[PDB]
Amino acid sequence: GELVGIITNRDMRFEVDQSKPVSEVMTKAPLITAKEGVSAEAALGLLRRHKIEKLPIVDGHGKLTGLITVKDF
Amino acid sequence: GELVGIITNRDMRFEVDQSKPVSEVMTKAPLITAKEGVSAEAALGLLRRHKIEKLPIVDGHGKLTGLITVKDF
Numbered sequence: 001g002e003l004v005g006i007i008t009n010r011d012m013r014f015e016v017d018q019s020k021p022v023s024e025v026m027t028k029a030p031l032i033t034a035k036e037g038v039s040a041e042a043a044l045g046l047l048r049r050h051k052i053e054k055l056p057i058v059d060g061h062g063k064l065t066g067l068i069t070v071k072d073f
Numbered sequence: 074g075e076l077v078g079i080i081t082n083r084d085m086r087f088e089v090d091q092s093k094p095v096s097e098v099m100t101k102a103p104l105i106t107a108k109e110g111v112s113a114e115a116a117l118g119l120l121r122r123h124k125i126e127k128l129p130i131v132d133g134h135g136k137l138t139g140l141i142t143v144k145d146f
């Protein structure tokens with residue numbers, strides 16, 4: 001139940017071997033994530049600073065509890 | 074005319090101050106580039122390895138002489 005990475009279409013596009021597992025392509029942790037209760041503005045600032053479109057939201061124990069995208073803004 | 078970086082729409086999407094110069098926003102050198110005579114296959118392989126959409130092509134002296142994009146493929 002712990003977050004160990006993320007896989008997006010920029011990774012999958014630049015990958016040819018379809019039979020590959022996710023573990024060989026994904027961006028492995030530590031990811032750019034945020035904690036519960038983060039304001040929208042701070043999440044937007046983090047997405048702007050790190051030039052990413054997805055921000056996993058995790059709890060106190062590292063369990064994934066949400067996902068914020070810049071597409072929603 | 075010596076190449077000192079690249080600025081793309083992701084960089085300018087994540088800078089709110091519209092009066093900023095390029096030097097403050099651009100991804101600075103050394104960039105992922107390639108030399109003249111690189112085949113489309115090696116250029117595509119580099120773009121796939123480094124998860125970027127653009128590839129400056131420079132000559133033997135570091136001067137920019139082309140630009141290869143994944144959108145063309």
Ligand SMILES: Nc1ncnc2c1ncn2[C@@H]1O[C@H](COP(=O)(O)OP(=O)(O)OP(=O)(O)O)[C@@H](O)[C@H]1O
Pocket residue numbers: 006007008009010011026027031032033051052053054055056124
């Ligand atoms: N939270 C994160 N922390 C670290 N890297 C991340 C995070 N989210 C995404 N990335 C990485 O950022 C890169 C770009 O992925 P992103 O999802 O931002 O673009 P995309 O939706 O694939 O883009 P496009 O719309 O151009 O196809 C990928 O290598 C991805 O693994």
Ligand SMILES: Nc1ncnc2c1ncn2[C@@H]1O[C@H](COP(=O)(O)OP(=O)(O)OP(=O)(O)O)[C@@H](O)[C@H]1O
Pocket residue numbers: 051079080081082083084099100104105106124125126127128129
């Ligand atoms: N050749 C390169 N070397 C290093 N960094 C680069 C290179 N080309 C682009 N970048 C940087 O990589 C990031 C993504 O740029 P890229 O042009 O690949 O995507 P984009 O066209 O802005 O994305 P999107 O289509 O999702 O809006 C930006 O921060 C950009 O400055």
Ligand SMILES: [Mg+2]
Pocket residue numbers: 053
């Ligand atoms: Mg996009």
Ligand SMILES: [Mg+2]
Pocket residue numbers: 126
């Ligand atoms: Mg794109």
